[PDB]
Amino acid sequence: ALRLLRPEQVLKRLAVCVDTAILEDAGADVLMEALEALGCECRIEPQRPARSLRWTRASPDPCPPPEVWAAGEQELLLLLEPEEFLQGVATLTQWISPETTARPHLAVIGLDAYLWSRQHAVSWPEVEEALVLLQLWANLDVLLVASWQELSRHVCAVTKALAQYPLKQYRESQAFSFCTAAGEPVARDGAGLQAAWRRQIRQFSRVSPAVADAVVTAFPSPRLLQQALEACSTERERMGLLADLPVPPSEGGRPRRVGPDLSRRICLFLTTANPDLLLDLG
């Protein structure tokens, strides 16, 4: 059971369905030139809003065995003429949406050329307020571009985003709650454990790998570091045991050390019995 679905093998299962009335601008071919080079499926067929395009991800053909591939439509860009856009800006002084299944989107090509030759009804701050009103009421962005290439740049960027989405969700979910990514190989005689123990110190927050090697050079086993902590008399010696350990100075001759914050965090890692203890805040 190998069972692998990368971004490059579900972009084959990605499909972009683009309305035929897109083509009445002869600069629309730039999209087709660019989204055939990407290996997603192109569908030139009439669409649920007209002069719009939508995305389609369907589950692969043998089909295993986990449960969610995130199949369905899941994105839809509705393209608008600038004067059709400026109607709805004037509507939102005192609603370009139907209600369909996927996440809605708007684009307008060449707006700031259009408002110059007409104005320079409404103007720019009426538009700027209406983008905020489209934001707040209906979670709705409008992609203001200046060419068909910039439209096609974003249309390809959406399409690479929808191919990488099922990879990312199966490491978001189905990873237990500490991850936010492989293991050091160990032989029969240990013998790679020191490079693993070096990286265990690097799993503390705010630790450069130069700092992490300075911990392990001093104390090359876990039992060699707890034995050094238990040889201290006062708790201050425990919290400052690793603090005086020299570090590469890093681009300026000012020499560095490991320092007290990490030295106390390692101290009340191994000595504490409270697993809910916060080592730091941030």
């Binding site: 985003a161 500490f178 240990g190 454990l193 020191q194 503390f204 876990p222 504490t272 697993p275 080592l279």
Partner: protein
């Protein structure tokens, strides 16, 4: 234990301290705002109690903005800080989340293709709303318009107080006490978090596997003390094989962790 009554309450902006400049520009557009320390994000709105002990009970609106300038955006992505940074924004209990991007100079440090992709990944996959502004003063003008919408969106709605246990203009909000301290311990590294993360630095140690070890021994003192009490070294080599390993619920893999955690010689 709070209600905000619609007859009077205060809808105002909270800004983070690290904006040292936008604070000059924001006062001109008549935006009612205070400056506070915010533990996740850079911009947030609260519902102040209007006439309380000069200590308002404050409910926090379901909107967060994080502003990365594009220069520091490239920095924060190329060192792995970015995925940790968005994940904190994703898990903060304010779930209409906006990602504000300022230009601030030339575009060419990282290429055009890869920067546009990650922003559109943040738009699509991570669920954020992307606003792109050109300078400091357009984004302040954006947040001016974004503030006066949220006043008008909450006019005459009645607001109540959720616990940290969890369209429509969203009432029943978190309080600002529950928000900050909830954001504190999202990013706060606990002993259990590290010890789980440390265990999976070994080849063969996985997420269901390491949380099983953490279920049996919650702190690293207890794994060492379990090793302390068992008498012969065959026991410590075979201590861990009987854990509740998996969703489903390693014999020689108990061996190699005991080589890490019982050897008083140096490792190799």
């Amino acid at each position: 234990p709070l209600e905000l009554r619609p007859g009077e309450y205060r809808v105002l902006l909270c800004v983070d301290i690290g904006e040292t400049e936008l604070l000059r520009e924001l006062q001109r557009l008549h935006v009612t705002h205070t400056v506070r320390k915010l533990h996740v994000g850079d911009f947030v709105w609260v519902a102040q109690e209007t006439n309380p002990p000069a200590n308002p009970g404050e409910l926090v609106l379901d909107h967060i903005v994080e502003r990365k300038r594009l220069d520091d955006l490239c920095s924060s992505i190329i060192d792995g800080r970015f995925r940790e940074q968005k994940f904190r924004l994703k898990r903060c209990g304010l779930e209409r989340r906006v990602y504000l991007v300022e230009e601030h100079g030339s575009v060419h440090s990282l290429p055009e293709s890869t920067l546009l992709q990650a922003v559109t990944n943040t738009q699509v996959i991570d669920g954020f709303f992307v606003k792109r502004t050109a300078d400091i003063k357009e984004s302040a003008a954006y947040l001016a318009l974004l503030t006066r919408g949220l006043q008008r969106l909450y006019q005459g709605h009645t607001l109540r107080s959720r616990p940290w246990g969890t369209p429509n203009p969203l009432c029943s909000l978190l309080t600002f006490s529950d928000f900050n301290a909830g954001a504190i311990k999202n990013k706060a590294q606990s002993v259990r978090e590290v010890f789980a993360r440390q265990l999976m630095q070994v080849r063969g140690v996985s997420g269901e596997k390491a949380a099983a070890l953490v279920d049996r021994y919650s702190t690293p003192a207890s794994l060492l003390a379990a090793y302390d009490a068992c008498a012969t070294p065959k026991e410590q080599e075979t201590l861990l094989s009987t854990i509740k390993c998996g969703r489903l619920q390693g014999p020689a893999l108990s061996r190699t962790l005991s080589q890490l955690y019982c050897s008083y010689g140096p490792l190799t």
